[PDB]
Structures are given as structure tokens and as C-alpha cells.
Symmetry: D3
Subunit: 266 residues, 6 copies
């Protein structure tokens, strides 16, 4: 179960309003790699785990922390939309506001009354297709590292899209929390690989066709990938290289369907 305090985890107040920045920050709230994706993925994985408490608790700690980041971004967006222009009266007040209006999300005013949405900057709704929880923590720890990496890259870009010290203060905190999240998930990942294997899942080595398991196949005519030839892979074996990959499966000959289907194909 959860409990809430009205106090934010860290400052989320800008020095000045900026409805364009509000739109950009929707990425961190409702976007593919944003805080809702983290919260929902880590909590889902945390609830699904039946294994080591060390990782299960780490996931519940972090998914709960991400709810605090969702709260911060939502709040920051609301502050950034204060006094945003949305009608002729604003333009009569100041005609330069037409370009600001042109760059805003029309729904921030019309649908949400100058409050945050749960969409990305282009109005695309956040959706559970962005969430991963597979039951396998070697795979999902790798996902959690990527989640924090794409997120931290976006936060770093956002840092250069504003000169507001209040906004940057919040971003500086999130950058740091994302550094910690990348590190802790890499540690868990490393511990899990040591236990189960560097290849996911680590118990299928005997089953796969080993003959194709370490060959770089050159399907494009560039020469760059040839530099991997002869390098030792993480599992201790070297890569070989095939300049001209061959088709080994033959030409398919699927049986025509039942006439009740009317599959008229010539």
C-alpha cells in the first residue's frame, strides 16, 4: 500500500512561466521513456518478483521514487502554464504572444484548463506499450538501465532548452537521481549476469545452433563491421566474419487456402 505527503521530493518551481517549455516537459511526463514509464515498469517488475529480496526491494524503492518525479514534473508544468496566452484578449494585450501561442499544445488550455496532460508534447497518450516486465530480471535490469539512460539523455537536452534557473535546478536533481538509477541497475544487472550468464536467458547454450552464434554477418556493403572480426566477445569467444552471408532456407511453397476463403491470387 502507499502513503502520500503533499511535500515534493525536490524543488519544482520555475522562476518564470514558459508554456513552450511546459510542452517540452510533457515528454518527461507522458513520453515513451518518461517518468510514468519508469514508475509503471519498476513497480510491475517489483510486484512480479518471487526472487532475491535485494532486487525486489530495489525495484519497489525505485518505482515509488519515480512517482515522486511524476508529481514534480506535473507540478512544474502547472507552474510553467501560469498566465499562458490562449485567446484574442491575450493578443490584444501583447501581439508578440502569437508566436508563443503557435508553439503551444492547444489542448493545454482547451482540454486541461492550463494544467498538465498525460500525453507527450505532440498530444500522443502515454500507453502501457512502453512498459516492460518479463519475469526475467537479467533482461529487465537491462531494460531499466536503458530507461534511465534515454531519460537522462532527454533531461540533459531539456537543460539546454531553457535558461530558467528554477527549471534547471529541478533538472540538476533529476540528472543526479538518474545517475544513481543507472548505476544501481547496472550493479544489479552485473550481479544477475554473474549468476545466470551474460546471454539472456543463460540456460539455452546447448539448444541453439552454436555454429552461427559468433559470426558477424555482413548484409550491408559498408566495411566498418569488419573491425569486430577477431575481437573477443564478452563470453570469451572471438567473432568471425562472413562478408557474403548466404541464404540457406530455400524458397517457400505454402499450400493455397480453402476455397471458402476466396483467396484469388492468380
Amino acid at each position: 500500500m502507499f502513503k502520500h505527503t503533499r511535500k515534493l521530493q525536490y524543488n519544482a518551481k520555475p522562476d518564470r512561466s514558459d508554456p513552450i517549455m511546459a510542452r517540452r516537459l510533457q515528454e518527461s511526463l507522458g513520453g515513451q521513456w518518461g517518468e510514468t514509464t519508469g514508475m509503471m515498469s519498476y513497480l510491475s517488475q517489483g510486484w512480479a518478483s518471487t526472487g532475491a529480496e535485494k532486487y525486489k526491494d530495489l525495484l519497489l524503492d525505485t518505482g515509488t521514487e519515480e512517482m515522486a518525479h511524476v508529481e514534480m514534473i506535473s507540478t512544474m508544468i502547472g507552474y510553467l502554464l501560469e498566465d499562458a496566452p490562449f485567446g484574442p484578449e491575450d493578443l490584444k494585450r501583447d501581439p508578440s504572444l502569437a508566436t508563443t501561442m503557435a508553439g503551444m499544445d492547444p489542448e493545454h488550455s482547451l482540454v486541461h484548463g492550463l494544467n498538465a496532460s498525460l500525453n507527450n508534447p505532440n498530444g500522443a497518450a502515454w500507453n502501457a506499450g512502453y512498459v516492460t516486465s518479463s519475469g526475467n530480471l537479467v533482461a529487465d535490469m537491462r531494460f531499466n538501465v536503458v530507461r534511465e539512460s534515454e531519460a537522462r539523455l532527454q533531461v540533459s537536452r531539456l537543460y539546454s532548452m531553457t535558461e530558467d534557473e528554477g527549471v534547471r535546478d529541478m533538472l540538476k536533481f533529476l540528472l543526479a537521481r538518474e545517475t544513481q538509477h543507472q548505476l544501481q541497475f547496472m550493479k544489479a544487472q552485473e550481479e544477475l549476469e554473474e549468476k545466470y550468464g551474460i546471454i539472456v536467458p543463460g540456460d539455452m547454450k546447448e539448444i541453439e545452433h552454436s555454429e552461427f552464434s559468433h559470426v558477424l554477418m555482413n548484409f550491408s556493403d559498408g566495411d566498418g563491421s569488419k573491425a569486430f572480426e577477431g575481437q573477443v566477445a564478452k563470453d570469451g569467444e572471438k567473432f568471425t566474419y562472413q562478408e557474403n552471408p548466404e541464404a540457406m532456407g530455400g524458397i517457400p511453397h505454402i499450400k493455397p487456402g480453402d476455397p471458402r476463403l476466396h483467396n484469388h491470387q492468380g
Copy 2:
């Protein structure tokens, strides 16, 4: 530009038909972590790169290979649907087929004439929300490792959902190529991390609030995560632990909106 040969990369013909397995394999064709997601992500990333040829070509080689995997899975699905039941005639010939029909995707017969769709097993259309190409290859190589990890996990599970030796032969080839892909991407990732830093992006360490960058925060009441306290993180610094994270940002108080919005909130 691309060129095509009708010959498959590797065998994709089952020993017998199985429309239930056909529906499961739709995961690998139109699902979140399936081969289409691979093909579109790697090609997009490769086209976007202005960097070292070694990684750009690796992406284009692999994206092109995943197109061959898409073709194989589509082909396998078509074979698996040969003679599938879809109407009263079929139940007339064999009433047991009713439980088979109940587990099939009704659109396989009705919309596609017993051929593959580009949806997952539940009819959800594949979509670009599953693709990642961010411009930063340290982050995107981590994504690519995850893409092949989740995929190989699913293929490993598919292997246990059939006893068809023809189906398994194809799966054993995919497992091996996914091993190679996981390895090559891990290699690329390690080289980029060496060049740019283990935290993504690597050039923001002076900007983040350092004080919070290595603190594990205990938001859930289990003690499992305390085990990380004092461990050395991949960047050479130790993790500290905070048993009681504090709310540091205060209580928000945003300004009420203009009356033209009619934000009646008591």
C-alpha cells in the same frame, strides 16, 4: 537501397500445421520486442549516425538481417496456418477442432485468409512507439542489447510451447543469431562507454547535483536494497544509503487560471 532474394536466410518450415503456435509466433513478428521492432530500430539508428563507420555499418548489417527474420517468421506463420479450421464444415469433419478454433486469432482467417498479420497474438497492431533511435549510441546500443535480450527470452519460451522439430529448428537458428546480436551490441556498448563515460550522457557530471548521485533511497519498507550500501558502483564510487528519504521541495501553490477557463475548483 535494398535487393531481395526469394531464398530464406534459414529453414522456416514446420513438420505440421498448428494454428495456435501460429498465433503465438505473431509475438515475434508484430510484438513489442519482435523482429519488426529490431529491423526498424537498427535501420533508423544506422541512417541517423554521422559517427564511426564501425557502428553505423554494424547497425545497417543487423537491421537488414532482421528483415530476413521478419520474412522467416511470416513464412513460418503461413505454413502453420495451412488447413486451419474456421467454420462449421471443419467441425463437421472433426468436432475436436472446436477447442483449436477457440484459441485461434479469428482475424487470421477472416481478415487475412489464413496468412500472417502484423499484429501481436492479441491483435494489437505493431507500432512505432516500440522503436528507439535517439541520436546517442551509448544509450541506443544499450537499447539494442535489451531488444535482443527480450526477444531471445521470448524465443526461448516459444521453444517450450511446441514439440514440432521443424519449428524448433528455426527457433534454434534465431537463438543463435540473437546470441551474436546480444554479443556484438555489448561490444559496441563497451567501446562507446570507454570513449564517452559509463553514465549517459557522459558530459554532464559537472552540472548534476552530485550530492544525490550515489545515494540509494529507501522508499519501500523492505530491507533488501540495504545490501548495496557500501558496494562500489561501476564509476568507482561507493553507494550510500538513506533509510528515510526526506521531502525537500515544499508544498506547491500554483496560481489559479484566468476566469475565461472556467476552472471552478471551490
Copy 3:
């Protein structure tokens, strides 16, 4: 069965063109709470009803009227897009059109030839996930009241986003029809609540855990909700208040999955 007349229900011509207003009005056509949502929801509910003709006919009457509103908004959008700027040649005649072009939906010209789409202002397609028809009219009449309330609020907001008297004339008519629809739906709601009960569905009181049915649980640390304590609910019973809600379900321990799943969780 339906029949159509080319004449519109009410005026839908603006005094002047305005492609920015055309984009906003997309919300009333293809948005979450727009006219298509009302049309599809009320017709579905009316077709589903096997009950009192009073409500079934009210639903078909209103659903049919909303089709007229869809027609009117589609028409208004077309008039508002007359002579809209979309390329260099327009800028040459009037270079002040650059900001207008920047705030337009690029698809209005490119995809639709300066005609309405069935998307919202951000290009998000209208979809059936916005529709509700549950088989229970006590619940669905509450939904219908909400549909008209959110719609009338957006129309009220649109009223302040233009000074065009022709646009406003149409909005004034819509406001009035939405007043009527809110009222007719509240009347039907009221009657049904009187027949079946105020809690939906009204025949489960003996089944629920009554001990928890009138307790306000304080999950967030603000004190505002305490004001409800001791007030009389709509069912005649008073609210009680719990300042410190308790976790009564214990800690879950679900069984680890079959090894064939490769759920490696440490």
C-alpha cells in the same frame, strides 16, 4: 435506419476564415469528449437497451442529434480553412501569414486538402476507447451527463478563443443544446436512481463488506478531507473518517514459475 437532409441543424458559417480556430474545433469533432463520442455512445446505448422506451428513445433522439452536430462542426472547419496558407506562394501575397502557418495542423492541407479530419487538434485519431455503453443505464446516464458537461466546458472555452460572431453564433446554439442534454440526462439519471438505488449497481449492498463502505481513508497528509467527517452521504448514512488507514492484507508471496519460463530473478 437513418435519412439525411442537406440542410444543417443550425448555422455553421464563420464571418471570416481562421485556420487556427479550425484546428481548435478539431477537439469538438475528433476529441475525447467531442460530438463523435456523444454520437457513438448514445446510439450504442440506445441500440443496447431492452428497457423503458422513455430512456431508449431519448438515447436515439440525442445520438441522432449529435450526428447533426458532427456535420455542423465538419462544415465550420471547412469554411474556416478557406484560403488557408500552405506554401511559399501564400507568403509572397501576404508574408504576415508565417505565424498562422506555424500554428496550423500540417495535415489539414497535406492530407485532407483543407478539409476536416477526424482527429483532435494534435492529430490523435478519434477512437472507440472514448465510448461507453455498459448495459446499465444508471451508470451510463451518469456517463452521458459527464460527456455533455466536459463538452460544454470545452465549448465555453472555445467561445473565448475567437471574436468571430459567426463562430460564436454556432457556439451559442451548441451551449444551449448541451444545457438541454445535461438536464435531460440528469432527469433520467434521477429517475433510474429512484428505481434502482443511488449506488451502482443497486443490488449488491448485502454482498459488500459494509464495515468499509462509509469510511473516508486519509492517504495523503493534508487535512482537508476531514471536513467530510460527520456529513450525511446521499444514502442517509454519515461518513466516518480514518486518519491512519491500515494495511490489512499482509505481504504477498507468490510461487516462482516453471523453469521453462526462464524467470531468472535472483
Copy 4:
């Protein structure tokens, strides 16, 4: 900010496993009117409010409670999927499992390792298009009443779809919480309506075309809606009835587009 305890709010363990019921319960977790829609709507509205603490705190109390319900449902799905059949070895052990297997979501095993997804029973991803937060609490409290009414209707149906006492125990608690949530939201609604008006928004009465505000228009030829004629609406004015609604807006003719659009329409 939020904190979490591993203890569930209320019991969420079934007496026996049942993967078909697990699939139905996905409706309460990832469905249109499910607990996720509840959690996200109330928290969004709560963070958005700048109004009375009485309602802001209520929204945050309830949004936070709904996160516990999400946690319970996810856990219950987990228990219900224990030992679920997913491959040929299971059918060899017990042939009768084939129909169970046919009615399951194939992704529960293949993608999630026999854990919950954030999809509905048909694999459709939960998405933010289900959420409402408009800035107007008279409208949004009406939405909140509907959200709890549709949810409680669904939980009531689920009660008749199982005979498991452990499952029913959880449903009996949810029923009771949905009773309190419907009531408290109705209470808040009534207070807001007294302050602002029964029509949303309450301040447009002098703007709308009053002549059409209380007329029931008969667009379908059934006779049932005439029963409203002469009844007093909630605002104290009687409904009038129009048996033959008139088209007052004429026939629109919009101007053909510029030749550069190639709008060839004969």
C-alpha cells in the same frame, strides 16, 4: 512525494489458481474504467487543483488509495496464474487443460512469465486517453462518480464469474470502497454545484441561445421521450417538446481549394 509498505491494503489471495479469472481481472487493472484510470485521474486532478483544500485533499487521498488497489489486483493476477498451463507437457499431463489454455491470454506466459500485464483482457494497452482532468471540478467530480460507477458495475459482474471465496473476499472489499468513493464524490459534486450552478460551466447562461435550452428534440420516431414533456428539470424550468425538429442552418457551400492542392472533385 510517496512512500510504500509491502503490506497490501486488504487480502488479495485466491483459494485456488484460475488463469481465466486472471484474464478477466486484467479489466480492473488495465481497462478503460479500471483502477489505473482511477489512480491517474484523481492524482492528476488533485495536483491540478488550486481550489478548496477539502476537494484537493480528497482527490489526493483517493488517488493514493487507488494505487493500493492497482497493487492488490496485480498481486491477485499473479496468484491466479500460478501453475498455469502453457505448453505441450501440460497437456500430456492433463488433456482437459486444452480448453483452459484456449481461453487464456497467450501473452501472460510468453511475454510476462505468468505475471500481470498493464493491458485489458484483450491485450489492449491501458492508455491516457481514458483519463480526465479538465481544471473544472464540477465536471470532473461527475466524471469521478462515473469512474466509480462503471468500475463497481464491473466488479459486481466479476463476482458472478467465480465461486472462489478468496477472490470474492477481495471483490467484497472493492465493492465497499467503490461505494464510499461514489458517495464522497457525489457529496463533493453537490457542494460544488451549489457554489457554481448545476449546468457546467455555471457562468454561461446569459451567453447561450436560451430558446433552445429546454427543448427535447425528437429525431427518432419512437414516442418514449415525449414522457419528459412538461417535467421540471433540475434548474426548475420545464421541458418543452418538439416532435419535428427543423433544420435552420441552410445548405453549405464551401469554396473549392487552390489548384496547388489538386482537389479534383468533378
Copy 5:
């Protein structure tokens, strides 16, 4: 404006209930090429037309007709769901219904009270991404012919998925209307091609690079398309054939982006 009559355009009552057929028929209501797609596309195009009344009226006639088909299919689904099984009590009456239950859409009972949804058989919501209205009727008439062709193909398939004479009677009516719709749209299509040209749009012949306009390029290694060489196209010119298409565009080299983006690509 529209008017409704409770009478259906044609019979839509099955001889017996069949909830599996109900689910299949969801394709005709909420699917990609179903009647809602026809209805919204033809009405959108008809409202957009500024051209000849012959086509504009045809579109409005047919779009209106399609609403009658939507109503018929919704009604049919309702009848087919009469007495459908959804709980243990049903299995107590007739254990053989377990398979029927496994094949049903779980939401028909749970969400809709055994009534139609606006989704396809797999629960995917109908959406406006299925609709086309471009402003060019040479293009859109071709789309309309396709719409009716895919629909009639699906109806033909449904015909073989039931032996219920009542259901087939309805299907026989739809096949005929779809024959008429295909013919009328092909006739309008032919007339518009005569006026504007067979290539869409017809006024760009002098602009395109004519050298590549009649060349069949052989990108896959089969010899089948060589049969087109020397055949005469519908514009009177013969197809030529290139066995080895050449890459004429060079190797792209885009400029590395600004460091503020952190595009670390090695």
C-alpha cells in the same frame, strides 16, 4: 441533419444465438474495413466536396446507408449474445459451454452487459486512422471501391462461418449492397478518370522525371514480373523492364549535430 426510424433497413435477426459468431461480426462493426469505416469515410468525403453534385450526393447517400448497416450489425450482435455463457452457473447448466466461453470476447459480458462493442474481434478499438478523405475524389473513389471490396470479401467469409439461415439472410443483403456500392464507385471513378486522367493526380505529367515513369524495376530475384515487359499500360505506353536497378543517389553524409544534443556516435 439526420432523422432516425426504429425500423431496420433489412432483417438482422438470427435463428439462434451464437456468441462466437457475435465476436466474428465485430469485425464488420469495429474493424479496419467495416461499416463504421465506410460510414465515416463517405460522410467525410461528401461533406468535403465542393464539386459536382452527382458525386457529392452519392457519397452522402451511401454514407447514410452505411449508418443503417452499422445499426443492423449492432442489432445482430445483440441477438447473437442472447443467453451467452459467462459464469459458473452457466457451466452448471451445461458443462459443454466451456469451449464456447473460451472462444468469446471476455468484454462482451464484463464491460458491455452482453451487447456490442465498437471494437474488432480482438478488442482493438475502431479508430479514425482507418478513414480516408483527401479532397481528391479520383483518389478517394478508388479508396471507396477498395473499402467495399475488402468488406464484401469479409462478408463472403462470414457466410461460410455460420449455418444460421437468419444470419445468412442478413449477409445476403449486405453482399448485394456491397455489389451496388462497388459498381457505383467504380462508375464515378471511371468518369473522374476521364475528366482528370488515369494517374492521380492527373496534372503533374510535365513535372515528374518521365524516364522512370514506365520502368518495371526488378528488386527481387524472381522472373515473374518480366511478364509485364512490353505489355501496354492503361495510359497507352508500354512497360519497359530493368533487371538490375541501379543505385543513383550516392552515399549520404549528414553533418554531426550541435554538442548540446549529446549525439555521441563514436
Copy 6:
């Protein structure tokens, strides 16, 4: 299987950057009727065909060509985004860039590092709901003609949305390839109609209710469509016309559902 060459099929380099045109070109990449739709539709149909090699090979040839067009568009967008403004430093250097920035897709910079997305200009993700492969090539060849028609119309419009000769050079090539694709698909369609019939599917004529197959029904009150009366349809029979379509199916009366559903409808 596929192979790739770094060389583009044709020139894809603009003379100058233009982030607004970049946004418009996303329609051709990730939009409903764009090159991705073509690629996936033709490959899917090609893989599904079990009929004549002439058509199967044609589909695979063209599907493979469309991948080159995807590559060209992705490349052209990357060049058009070179040096695009995204933050305050840009505006400090040149304040006139504000209107450009206002019209851009915010995700081009923030998510993709000034590279292409797989979304349309409005950020709506490309999805498989755009693709058709039905198993019947008479219907699907009609689809393919439409796909190239809508695409070519959009390309023709883009031509008028820029004065850049480099961009225009690319569009001139696409226009020609789309002329060829329209023609080749119309040729195949014609051959298939000649073999199977002009109505799709061609083998259901004795089943449909013939009485209704050639009747134009006047559902909207315009007189335009009467002009089709007596004209000869493509199947050699004349159209009749019905000025007042009659409702022949009566008034539906479906049975009230089981009480366990709580369908309270009055």
C-alpha cells in the same frame, strides 16, 4: 532474404536545411499512406501469395523498392534538420528563428537528436492498422493502386510546399515511380478482374439477394445521384434508382439479459 547497399536509389539531398519541410516529409515516412505502409503492405501480400508468379514477384519487387524510398525519406529529413534551432542559444544568435521553432516537431530535437522519427508530422506513430493483406489479390491490388494514388497526391502537394530544387528533384523521382506503381498495379488488377470477375469476390453472385444489387438508394435529399439511373454498370447491367428507400427489417426486440449482469435499463 535481403541485402543492402549504402547508395541511395536516387538523390535525397536538399539544397538547404528547412526543419518545417522536415516535419511535413514525416507524412511520407510514418503517415497513413506513406512509404512504410507501401513497404509493409506489398511485402506481406507478396509473402502470402501462393498463386501466379507474375503477381507474387511484382509485389516483392515493389515492396523492396519501397524500402529504398523509406531510406531516401529518412535521409532527406536528416539533411533538412541540419542546424535546426532548439534552444535559447539559437534564439540569441538569431531571434527571427522563433517562428521556425514554433512550427517544428519538438520531438525531432528532444527525442531523436535532429533525426527522423517513424511518426507522422503530428507525432502519431505509424502502425500496422494502415496495412492490408487479405489473401485476395483482386481486392489487394485495388488497395495497392489506392496506396500509390494517395501517396502521389501527397507528394504532389509537397511539391508546392517548397521552392528547394534539391527537395523537388527527389519529389520528381518519387512522382515518376508512383506513376509506374499505379500503372503496374492497375494492369495486374485488370488481369485479375478478367479472371475472377469485377465484383470482389467474383464467386458469390448466386448467393447475394440479386434484387438489391443494382439499386441506387437515395438516403440524402440531394438529387445528384439520380444521374446514375439507367447508366450501365461495369458488369453490364443498368442501375435503377429508388427515391424513397424503405425500411424492411422491422423493429428489433432483443431479450433482457441475465440478472447477474445488473443491466438496469428501466
